[PDB]
């Protein structure tokens, strides 16, 4: 409910501080134990090149 209240105010940077990533990096490894891979890709809006984030 605290996350919802912060989102309702639109305080995006306060929410980021209060959440921080180890929570997501640990999630990827547990999904890997089930033979699933979760890759995070960034597509550049300038040259359309895809970057695989180090997760």
């Amino acid at each position: 409910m605290e996350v919802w209240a912060l989102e309702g105010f639109g305080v995006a940077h306060i929410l980021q501080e209060m959440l921080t990533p180890e929570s997501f990096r640990l999630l990827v490894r547990e999904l890997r134990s089930l033979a699933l891979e979760l890759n995070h890709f960034l597509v550049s809006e300038k040259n359309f090149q895809i970057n695989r984030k180090e997760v």
Partner: protein, 545 residues
């Protein structure tokens, strides 16, 4: 304007055996956790330092188990509706016995030559297949083509998946779907089966996911730091898998397959595996699934104790000591805070000023002030305390979350901080005017005049009048008194031209000769006090801003 485009995506997909190996390289081959004598991680065990790292990389480094026999992934076989059964168009009953019962499937493949007229699932064993055929072709020559006429276990399923022609599935499903259309609870059910099968086939074609990856050849291993239940399940899988490779049987393959099912998703077969203390093992599927009132405080402020404030703002107090050269470095700045050197509290007041904190409209932002005592002091119209660190977070707290730009609730637009309880009775008693009628006079009747409101209030302070005693107030503004819209009770009209209009709450003096218009209001100092409080609040704020 042009949007600031941001294109980010994440995808999940089934993982190839090659990708599983690429994660680890790294093979765990021993069921040992830790040595009893040296208390060191066993070599090539679940905690091997050559596989996972020395005792931060142990939180992220994967390993893998090389299965002697392939095992189906329990997600895609048993969770109804089954994906493997739907893709192969075989009932899960006839396909589950190929995994957990003593059955065998004939003609698993169709892309290589065969010379036997066997087909389908054989619950028993072929009699001639046991002695005559292996003898006729010799055992060494028989093993080459043995797993092409009839196979068993999860490996037989993987051969069927790998040899599937996904484009043939789409055309066969479509023609069968239309044939049922030209022709009651089974026809509809069979149509839904065909649509799911052709939908499933299409997704494999346009993606890089291979359907044979639903049968696991390698088993990825969680990093040790995430498993400081799961360890016992891993040892159980390793133990039986090492036993099976020593024999090289079908009963042992079931033990390996069942153990992997327990590791991946327990509670899918019936009675789940339980340990000696009667506890059901948790698989990975289970894993993934004081305040004191302060009435003098402002609406935007709060009071923090020294003991709480110094911990919340310790980083800023240290920087303030170093900046003003009261402490040489970080180490000295800590000792002064430890020893309660009085210069610490002067710095604490400085760094707290202008730095809002979040208190958890359940969470709001207030400007903290140091208060005496040991308790947190909140204003009467309102435990976790958060201190924003970055300037972006401090800007949001001051400009978006403060208790004065959120005076209206979003539900219907009502005010939030309306006075209540003791605040409300004080206003009610203050504005409850004079007694009237039979409550004011014992008998049927068949008051001071004040030039301005300050004289009336001054007479009240000198105990000359009571809070609810009626009085007449000379009024030198416009007629702005909320009252019943009524004609005068009485008009007293002098023959020289002046007339007095007596209303229920005010008297108006007018004339037919002059333009005079004098207003006297019958009120109490309580009503005057309430009007003055709001008016002086508005005037005071305007002058200060």
């Amino acid at each position: 304007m042009i949007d600031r485009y941001k294109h980010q995506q994440l995808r999940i997909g089934l993982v190839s055996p090659q990708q599983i190996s690429a994660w680890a390289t790294g093979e765990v081959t021993k069921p040992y956790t830790f040595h009893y004598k040296t208390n060191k991680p066993e070599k090539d065990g679940l905690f091997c330092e050559r596989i996972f790292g020395p005792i931060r990389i142990r939180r992220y480094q994967m390993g893998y188990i090389k299965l002697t026999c392939p095992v189906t992934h329990v997600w895609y076989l048993k969770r109804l509706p089954s994906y493997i059964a739907n893709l192969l168009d075989k009932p899960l009953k006839e396909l589950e016995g190929l995994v957990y019962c003593d059955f065998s499937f004939a003609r698993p493949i169709t892309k290589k030559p065969t010379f036997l007229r066997l087909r389908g699932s054989f619950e028993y064993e072929i009699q001639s297949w046991k002695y005559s055929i292996p003898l006729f072709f010799t055992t060494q020559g028989f093993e080459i083509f043995r797993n092409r006429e009839i196979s068993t276990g999860a490996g037989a399923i993987r051969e069927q998946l790998a040899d599937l022609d996904l484009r043939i599935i789409i055309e066969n499903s479509l023609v069968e779907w239309k044939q049922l259309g030209e022709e009651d609870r089974k026809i509809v059910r069979r149509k839904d089966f065909l649509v799911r099968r052709m939908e499933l086939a299409k997704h494999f074609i346009r993606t890089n996911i291979e359907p044979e990856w639903m049968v696991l050849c390698l088993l990825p291993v969680l990093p040790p730091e995430l498993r400081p239940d799961i360890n016992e399940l891993y040892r159980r899988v390793i133990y039986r898998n090492n036993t099976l490779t020593d024999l090289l049987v079908m009963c042992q393959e079931k033990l390996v397959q069942e153990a992997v099912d327990t590791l991946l998703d327990n509670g899918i077969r019936g009675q789940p595996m339980r340990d000696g203390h009667n506890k059901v093992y948790k698989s990975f599927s289970d894993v993934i699934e004081v305040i004191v009132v302060g009435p003098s405080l402002s609406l935007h402020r709060c009071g923090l104790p020294r003991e709480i404030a110094i911990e919340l703002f310790q980083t800023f107090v240290i920087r303030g000591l170093i900046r003003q050269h009261l402490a040489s470095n970080i180490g000295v700045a800590k000792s002064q805070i430890r020893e309660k050197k009085p210069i610490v509290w002067e710095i604490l007041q400085e760094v707290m000023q202008g730095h809002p904190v979040l208190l958890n409209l359940g969470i709001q932002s207030f400007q903290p002030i140091l208060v005496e005592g040991r308790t947190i002091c909140l204003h009467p119209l309102v435990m976790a305390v958060h201190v924003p660190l970055s300037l972006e977070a401090q800007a949001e707290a001051r400009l978006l979350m403060f208790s004065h730009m959120n005076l209206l609730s979003p539900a219907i637009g009502d005010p939030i901080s309306v006075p209540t309880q003791d605040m409300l009775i004080g206003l009610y008693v203050l504005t409850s005017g004079t007694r009237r009628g039979i409550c004011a006079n014992r008998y049927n009747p068949c008051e001071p005049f004040f030039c301005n409101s300050y004289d009336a209030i001054g007479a009240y302070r000198q105990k000359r009048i009571n809070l609810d005693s009626p009085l007449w107030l000379r009024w030198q503004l416009d007629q702005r008194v909320i009252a019943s819209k009524e004609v005068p009770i009485e008009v007293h009209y002098e023959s020289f031209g002046n007339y007095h209009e007596i209303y229920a709450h005010y008297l108006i003096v007018r004339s037919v000769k002059k333009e005079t218009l004098y207003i006297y209001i019958r009120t109490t100092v309580g009503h005057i006090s309430f009007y003055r409080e709001i008016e002086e609040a508005i005037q005071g704020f305007s002058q200060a801003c």
